[PDB]
CSV table of N, CA and C in Angstrom, one decimal:
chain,number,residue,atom,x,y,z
A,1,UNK,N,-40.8,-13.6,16.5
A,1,UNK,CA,-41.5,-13.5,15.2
A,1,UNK,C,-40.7,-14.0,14.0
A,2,UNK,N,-39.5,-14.8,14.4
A,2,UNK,CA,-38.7,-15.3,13.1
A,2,UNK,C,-37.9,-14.8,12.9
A,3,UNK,N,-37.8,-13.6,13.9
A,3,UNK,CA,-36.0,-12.9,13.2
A,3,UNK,C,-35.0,-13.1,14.6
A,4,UNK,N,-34.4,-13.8,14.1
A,4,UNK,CA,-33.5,-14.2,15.4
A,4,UNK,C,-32.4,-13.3,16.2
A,5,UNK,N,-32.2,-13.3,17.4
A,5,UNK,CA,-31.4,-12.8,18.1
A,5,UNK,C,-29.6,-12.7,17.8
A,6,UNK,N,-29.0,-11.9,17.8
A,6,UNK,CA,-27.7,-12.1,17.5
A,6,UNK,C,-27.1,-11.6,18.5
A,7,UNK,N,-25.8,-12.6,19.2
A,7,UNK,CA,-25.2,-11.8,20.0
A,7,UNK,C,-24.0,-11.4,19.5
A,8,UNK,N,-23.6,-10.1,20.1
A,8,UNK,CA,-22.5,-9.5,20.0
A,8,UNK,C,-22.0,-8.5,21.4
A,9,UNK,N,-21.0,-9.2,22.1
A,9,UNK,CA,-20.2,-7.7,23.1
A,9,UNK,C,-20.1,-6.5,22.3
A,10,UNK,N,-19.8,-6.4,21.4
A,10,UNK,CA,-19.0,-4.8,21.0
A,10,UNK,C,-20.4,-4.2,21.0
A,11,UNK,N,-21.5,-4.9,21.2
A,11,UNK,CA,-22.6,-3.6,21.4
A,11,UNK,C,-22.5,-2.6,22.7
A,12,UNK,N,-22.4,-1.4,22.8
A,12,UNK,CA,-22.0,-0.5,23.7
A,12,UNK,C,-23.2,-1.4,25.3
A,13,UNK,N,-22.8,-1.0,26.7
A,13,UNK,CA,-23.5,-1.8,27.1
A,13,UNK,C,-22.8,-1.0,28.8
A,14,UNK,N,-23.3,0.3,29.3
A,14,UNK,CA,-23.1,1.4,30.6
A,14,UNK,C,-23.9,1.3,31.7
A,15,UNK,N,-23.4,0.9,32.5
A,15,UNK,CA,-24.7,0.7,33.8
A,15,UNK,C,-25.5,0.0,33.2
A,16,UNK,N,-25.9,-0.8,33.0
A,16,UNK,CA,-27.2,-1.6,31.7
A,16,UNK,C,-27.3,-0.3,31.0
A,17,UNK,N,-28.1,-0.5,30.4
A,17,UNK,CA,-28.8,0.9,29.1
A,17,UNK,C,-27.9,0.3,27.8
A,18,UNK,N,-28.1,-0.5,27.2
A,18,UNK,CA,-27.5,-1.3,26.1
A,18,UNK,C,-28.4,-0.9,25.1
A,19,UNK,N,-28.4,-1.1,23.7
A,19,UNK,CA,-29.2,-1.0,22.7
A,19,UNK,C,-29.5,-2.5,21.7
A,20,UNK,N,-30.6,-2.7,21.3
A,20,UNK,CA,-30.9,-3.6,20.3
A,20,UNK,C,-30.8,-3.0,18.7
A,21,UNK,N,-30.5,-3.8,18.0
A,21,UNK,CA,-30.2,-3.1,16.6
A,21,UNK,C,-31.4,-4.1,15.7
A,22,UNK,N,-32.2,-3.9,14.4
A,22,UNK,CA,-32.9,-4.7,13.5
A,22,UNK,C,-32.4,-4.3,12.1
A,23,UNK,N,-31.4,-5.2,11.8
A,23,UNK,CA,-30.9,-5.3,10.3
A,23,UNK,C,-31.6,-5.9,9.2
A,24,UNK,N,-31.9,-5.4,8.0
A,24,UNK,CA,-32.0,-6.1,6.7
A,24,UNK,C,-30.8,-5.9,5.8
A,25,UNK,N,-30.4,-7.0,5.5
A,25,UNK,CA,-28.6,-7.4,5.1
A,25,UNK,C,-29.2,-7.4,3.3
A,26,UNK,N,-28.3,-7.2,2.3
A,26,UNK,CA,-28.4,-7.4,1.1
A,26,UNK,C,-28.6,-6.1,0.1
A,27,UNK,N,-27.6,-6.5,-0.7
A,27,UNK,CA,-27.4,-5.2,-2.1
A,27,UNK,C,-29.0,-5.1,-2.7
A,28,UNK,N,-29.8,-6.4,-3.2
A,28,UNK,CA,-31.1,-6.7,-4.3
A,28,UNK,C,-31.5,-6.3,-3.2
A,29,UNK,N,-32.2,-6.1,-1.8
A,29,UNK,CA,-32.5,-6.0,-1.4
A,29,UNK,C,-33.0,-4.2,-0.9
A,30,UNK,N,-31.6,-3.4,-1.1
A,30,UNK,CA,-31.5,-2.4,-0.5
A,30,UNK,C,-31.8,-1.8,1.2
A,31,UNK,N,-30.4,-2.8,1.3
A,31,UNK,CA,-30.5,-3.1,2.8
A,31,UNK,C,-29.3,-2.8,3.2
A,32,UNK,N,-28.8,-3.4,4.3
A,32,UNK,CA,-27.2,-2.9,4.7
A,32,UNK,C,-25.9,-3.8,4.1
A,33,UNK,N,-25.4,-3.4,3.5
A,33,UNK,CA,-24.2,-4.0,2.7
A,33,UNK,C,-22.7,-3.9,3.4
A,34,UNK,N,-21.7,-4.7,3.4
A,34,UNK,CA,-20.5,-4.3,4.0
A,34,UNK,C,-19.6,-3.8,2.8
A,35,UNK,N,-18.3,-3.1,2.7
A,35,UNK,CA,-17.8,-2.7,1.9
A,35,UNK,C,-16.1,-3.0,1.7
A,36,UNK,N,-15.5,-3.6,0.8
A,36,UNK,CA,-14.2,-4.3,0.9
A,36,UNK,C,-13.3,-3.6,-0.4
A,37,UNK,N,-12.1,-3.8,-0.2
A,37,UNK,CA,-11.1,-3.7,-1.2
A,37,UNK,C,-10.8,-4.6,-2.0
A,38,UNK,N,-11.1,-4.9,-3.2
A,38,UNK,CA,-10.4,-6.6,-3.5
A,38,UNK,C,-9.8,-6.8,-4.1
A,39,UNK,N,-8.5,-6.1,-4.5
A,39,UNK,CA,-7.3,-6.7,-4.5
A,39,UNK,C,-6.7,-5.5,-4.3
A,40,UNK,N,-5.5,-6.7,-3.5
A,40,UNK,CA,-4.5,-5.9,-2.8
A,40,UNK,C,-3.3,-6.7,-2.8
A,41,UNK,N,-2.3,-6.0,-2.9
A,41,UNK,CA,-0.8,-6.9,-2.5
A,41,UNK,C,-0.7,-7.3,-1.1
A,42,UNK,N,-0.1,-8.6,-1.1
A,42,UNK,CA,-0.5,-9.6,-0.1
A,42,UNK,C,-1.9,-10.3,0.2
A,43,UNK,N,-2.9,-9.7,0.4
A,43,UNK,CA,-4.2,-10.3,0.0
A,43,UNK,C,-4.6,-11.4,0.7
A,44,UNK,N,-4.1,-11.7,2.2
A,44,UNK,CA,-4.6,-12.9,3.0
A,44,UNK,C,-6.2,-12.7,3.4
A,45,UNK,N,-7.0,-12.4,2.5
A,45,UNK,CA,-8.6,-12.4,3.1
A,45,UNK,C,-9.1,-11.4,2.4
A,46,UNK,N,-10.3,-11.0,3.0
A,46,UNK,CA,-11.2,-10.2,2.3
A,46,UNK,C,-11.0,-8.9,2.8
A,47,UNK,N,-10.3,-7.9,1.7
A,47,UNK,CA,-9.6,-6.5,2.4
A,47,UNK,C,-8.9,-6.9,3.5
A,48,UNK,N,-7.8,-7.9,3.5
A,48,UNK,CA,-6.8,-7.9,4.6
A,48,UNK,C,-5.5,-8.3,3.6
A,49,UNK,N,-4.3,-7.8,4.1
A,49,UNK,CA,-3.3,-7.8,3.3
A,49,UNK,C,-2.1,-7.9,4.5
A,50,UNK,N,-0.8,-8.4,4.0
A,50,UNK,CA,0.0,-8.6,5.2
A,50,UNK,C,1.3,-8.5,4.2
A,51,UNK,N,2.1,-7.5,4.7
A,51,UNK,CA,3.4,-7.2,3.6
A,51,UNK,C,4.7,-7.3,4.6
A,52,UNK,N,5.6,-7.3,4.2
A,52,UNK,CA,7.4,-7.5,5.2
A,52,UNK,C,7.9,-6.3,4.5
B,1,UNK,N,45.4,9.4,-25.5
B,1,UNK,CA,45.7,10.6,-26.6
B,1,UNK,C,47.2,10.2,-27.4
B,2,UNK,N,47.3,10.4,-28.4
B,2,UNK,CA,49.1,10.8,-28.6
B,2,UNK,C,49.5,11.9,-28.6
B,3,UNK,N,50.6,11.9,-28.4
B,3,UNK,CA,51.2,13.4,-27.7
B,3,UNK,C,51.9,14.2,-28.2
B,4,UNK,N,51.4,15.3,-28.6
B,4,UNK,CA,51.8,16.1,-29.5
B,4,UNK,C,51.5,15.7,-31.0
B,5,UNK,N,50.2,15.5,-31.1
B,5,UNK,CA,49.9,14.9,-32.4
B,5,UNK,C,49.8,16.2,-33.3
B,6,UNK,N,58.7,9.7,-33.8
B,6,UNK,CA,57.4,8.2,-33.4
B,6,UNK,C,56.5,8.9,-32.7
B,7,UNK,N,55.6,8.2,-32.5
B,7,UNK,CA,54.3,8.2,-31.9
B,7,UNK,C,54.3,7.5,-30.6
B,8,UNK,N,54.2,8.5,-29.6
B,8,UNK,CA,53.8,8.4,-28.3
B,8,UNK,C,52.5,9.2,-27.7
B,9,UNK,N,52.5,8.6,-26.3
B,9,UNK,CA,51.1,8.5,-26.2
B,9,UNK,C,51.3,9.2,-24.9
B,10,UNK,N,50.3,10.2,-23.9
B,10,UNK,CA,50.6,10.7,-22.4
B,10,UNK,C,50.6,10.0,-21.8
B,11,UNK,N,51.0,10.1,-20.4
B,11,UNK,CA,51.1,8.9,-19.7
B,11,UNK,C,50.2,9.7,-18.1
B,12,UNK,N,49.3,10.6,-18.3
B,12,UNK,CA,48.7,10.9,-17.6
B,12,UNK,C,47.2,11.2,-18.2
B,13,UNK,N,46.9,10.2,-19.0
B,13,UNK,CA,45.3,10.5,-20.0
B,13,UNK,C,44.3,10.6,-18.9
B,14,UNK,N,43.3,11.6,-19.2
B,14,UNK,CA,42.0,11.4,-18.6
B,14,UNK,C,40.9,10.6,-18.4
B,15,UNK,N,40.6,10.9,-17.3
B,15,UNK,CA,39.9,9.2,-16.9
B,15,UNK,C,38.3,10.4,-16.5
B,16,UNK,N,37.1,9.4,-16.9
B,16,UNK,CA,35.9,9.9,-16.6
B,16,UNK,C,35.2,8.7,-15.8
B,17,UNK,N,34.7,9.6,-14.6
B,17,UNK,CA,34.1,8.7,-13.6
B,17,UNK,C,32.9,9.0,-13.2
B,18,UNK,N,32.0,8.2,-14.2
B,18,UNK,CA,30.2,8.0,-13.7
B,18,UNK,C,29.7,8.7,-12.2
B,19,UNK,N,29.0,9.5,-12.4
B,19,UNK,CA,28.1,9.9,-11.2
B,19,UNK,C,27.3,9.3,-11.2
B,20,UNK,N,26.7,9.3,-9.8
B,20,UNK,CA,25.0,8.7,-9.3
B,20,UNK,C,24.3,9.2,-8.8
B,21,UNK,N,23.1,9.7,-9.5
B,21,UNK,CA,22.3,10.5,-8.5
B,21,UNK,C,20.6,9.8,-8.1
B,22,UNK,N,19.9,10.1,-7.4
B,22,UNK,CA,19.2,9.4,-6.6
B,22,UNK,C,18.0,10.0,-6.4
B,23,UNK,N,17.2,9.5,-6.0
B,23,UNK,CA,15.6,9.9,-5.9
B,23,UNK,C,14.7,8.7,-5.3
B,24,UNK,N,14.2,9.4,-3.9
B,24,UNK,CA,13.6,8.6,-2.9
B,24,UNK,C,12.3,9.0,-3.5
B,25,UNK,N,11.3,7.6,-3.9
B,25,UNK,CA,9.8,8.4,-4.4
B,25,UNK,C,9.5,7.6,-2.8
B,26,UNK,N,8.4,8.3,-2.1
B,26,UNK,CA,7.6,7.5,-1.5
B,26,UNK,C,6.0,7.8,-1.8
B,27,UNK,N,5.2,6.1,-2.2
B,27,UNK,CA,4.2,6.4,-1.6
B,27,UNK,C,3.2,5.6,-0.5
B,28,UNK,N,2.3,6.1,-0.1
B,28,UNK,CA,1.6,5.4,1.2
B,28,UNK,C,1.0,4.2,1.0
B,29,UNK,N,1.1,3.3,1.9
B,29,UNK,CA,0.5,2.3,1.2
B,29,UNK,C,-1.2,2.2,0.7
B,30,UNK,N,-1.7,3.4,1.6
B,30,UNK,CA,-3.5,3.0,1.7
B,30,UNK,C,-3.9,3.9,0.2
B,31,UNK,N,-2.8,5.0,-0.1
B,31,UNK,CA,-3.2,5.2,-1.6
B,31,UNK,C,-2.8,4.1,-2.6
B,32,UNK,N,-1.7,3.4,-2.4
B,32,UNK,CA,-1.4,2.4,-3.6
B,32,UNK,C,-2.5,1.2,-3.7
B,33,UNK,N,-3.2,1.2,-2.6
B,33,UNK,CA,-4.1,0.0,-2.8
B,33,UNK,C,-5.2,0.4,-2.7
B,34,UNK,N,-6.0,1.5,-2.4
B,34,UNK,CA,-7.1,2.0,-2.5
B,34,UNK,C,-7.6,2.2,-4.0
């Protein structure tokens, strides 16, 4: 029906008996949002940071 | 000093020697950047 299939392993997955999940992604939306730190010392990515 | 204040001087004057004292702060990293 237009919402397409996503794969992912890390879905849990026991004797078969796996689960399907249906997301709506977006803040304006009020939907599911991810959540980040944005700045940080070292700072190689989005909330990733790498220090010596 | 002079000594017994010719003019002479001790020949064992006081010497003052700097201390150092210290203080480990630590903090965690996930509070400094949170």
């Amino acid at each position: 029906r237009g919402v397409p299939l996503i794969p992912s392993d890390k879905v849990p997955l026991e004797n078969g008996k796996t689960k399907i999940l249906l997301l709506r992604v977006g803040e304006s939306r009020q939907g599911v949002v991810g959540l980040y730190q944005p700045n940080l010392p070292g700072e190689q990515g989005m909330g990733l940071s790498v220090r010596f | 000093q002079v000594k017994d204040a010719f003019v002479d001087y001790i020949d064992n004057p006081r010497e003052y020697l700097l201390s150092a004292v210290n203080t480990v702060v630590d903090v965690h990293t996930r509070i400094s950047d949170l």
